[PDB]
Amino acid sequence: MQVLFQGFNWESWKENGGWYNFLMGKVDDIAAAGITHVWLPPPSHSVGEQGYMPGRLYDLDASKYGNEAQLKSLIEAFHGKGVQVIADIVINHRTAEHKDGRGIYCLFEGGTPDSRLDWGPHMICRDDPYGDGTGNPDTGADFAAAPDIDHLNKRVQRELIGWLDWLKMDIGFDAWRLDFAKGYSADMAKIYIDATEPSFAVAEIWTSMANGGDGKPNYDQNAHRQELVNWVDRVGGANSNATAFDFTTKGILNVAVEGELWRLRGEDGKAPGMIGWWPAKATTFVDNHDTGSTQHLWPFPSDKVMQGYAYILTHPGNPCIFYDHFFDWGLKEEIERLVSIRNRQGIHPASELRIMEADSDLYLAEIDGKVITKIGPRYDVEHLIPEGFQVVAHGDGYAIWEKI
Ligand SMILES: [Ca+2]
Ligand SMILES: [Ca+2]
Ligand SMILES: [Ca+2]
DSSP: OOOEEEOOOTTGGGOTTOHHHHHHTTHHHHHHTTOOEEEEOOOSOBSSTTSSSBOOTTOOTTOTTOOHHHHHHHHHHHHHTTOEEEEEEOOSBOOOSEEOTTSOEEEOOOSSSSSTTOOOGGGBOTTOTTSOSOSOOOSSOOOTTSOBBOTTOHHHHHHHHHHHHHIIIIIOOOEEEETTGGGSOHHHHHHHHHHHOOSOEEEOOOOOOOBOTTSSBOSOOHHHHHHHHHHHHHHTGGGSOEEEEOHHHHHHHHHHTTTOGGGGSOTTSSOSSGGGTOGGGEEOBSOOTTTSTTTOSSOOOGGGHHHHHHHHTTSSSOOEEEHHHHHTSSOHHHHHHHHHHHHHTTOOTTOOEEEEEEETTEEEEEETTTEEEEESSOOOOGGGSOTTEEEEEEETTEEEEEEO
C-alpha cells in the first residue's frame, strides 16, 4: 500500500565511490520488498557534509552524496521499478556564500550564473543576528547555527517554489520531507506544498517529551500528539497529501519495549501516539539518522528493534523503514516478511486497530479484523487468539497471526 524507506544514514556521505552510486545497487532489493517511497538526503551544496547546512541550492554537483547526473539516474532507477522518491527539503535555514561589509556571511548564492536565490540579509529573519534586522520576524523557531530564512518575503517564496519545481520536474523528485518543520509556520509550509503538488509529504516536527520524576515519558502524551495533529489540520488536512512523523509513537515505543508495554494502550483504549488520533496522517518509524545511526540522540533499544517493526509494519499509519535496520543488522528477511503480510492483508494508513491486551510483558492487537500482532517476551498467548487465526511470522519478542 504505502511503505517508506529512509535510504541513508549519518555516515552515508563518506561512502567510498559515493552514496548514490552505492544505493544504485540496492534499488531492486528495495522495490522487491514492497517499499513504495524512498527518502534521499538533502542534495544541495552544504557547509556540513550530511547536507543540513545548504547554501547553493541549485548546486547538486557539489553534494558529498554524488553529483547531479548520478542523483538523476538513481531517481530514474527507482522510478523504473515503481518506487517514488522523497527529497529531504531543508528550507528553515540556509548558509550564505559571501561576507557583507560587516564581515558576516549573509550574501547568498543559488549556484547558477543568474540571480535566482542570490538573496541578502534582508531575506534573513528579523531577530537572527546573521541578518540586518529588516526582515520579518521568524514564523517559527530559530536555528542558532545558521541564518533563518524569512518565509514571509515574497521573493523567497517565489524562488524556493521555482527550486522545488526544478527538483520535481527536472531532477525527478515526487515528494518532500520537511526538515525542522517547527522552524517556520504551517501556513508557510502550506504555501510550498500547495504550489508544488507533491504525491506525498512528511513534516519533521520534533518536540521533547514531558517526563516523570523517574526520567521516563509520561504515560499521557496528548499535548505531544496534539501538536502534530494541529500542524496537519493547518496545512489543509485531507485536502493535502502532507503527513507528520509520529515522534509520539517513537518516544513511547522506546520506553514501552523495556518491560512497560501497557504504555501502548492509552486511557481511552486507543494507541497513545499520533496513529491513535489520525493514523492516515501519521508516518511511523523505529529510528532515523538523528535518533539512531552514529548520532544516537534517541535510540530504540537495540535488542528490541524487530518489536518496533512488528508494531509499525502491521499497524495503522505510513510506516518508514530505516536503512541500517534493513541492510546492516541481519534483519532484511524478517522485515520483508512483515511488509508482505501488511500488503496481502490489505493493511493501509487508515486501517482499524483493536487493542486486545497491554501488560508489561505483552502487547496484543488486532488490525482490520485480519491480523493479530503480539510483541514482548511473553510467548504463551494461544487462549487470547481467536479461532481461525494462524501464526505467519515470529522472531525475538514478536509474533504475527493472520485470519485463516
Ligand atoms: Ca547566482
Ligand atoms: Ca538562525
Ligand atoms: Ca525559522
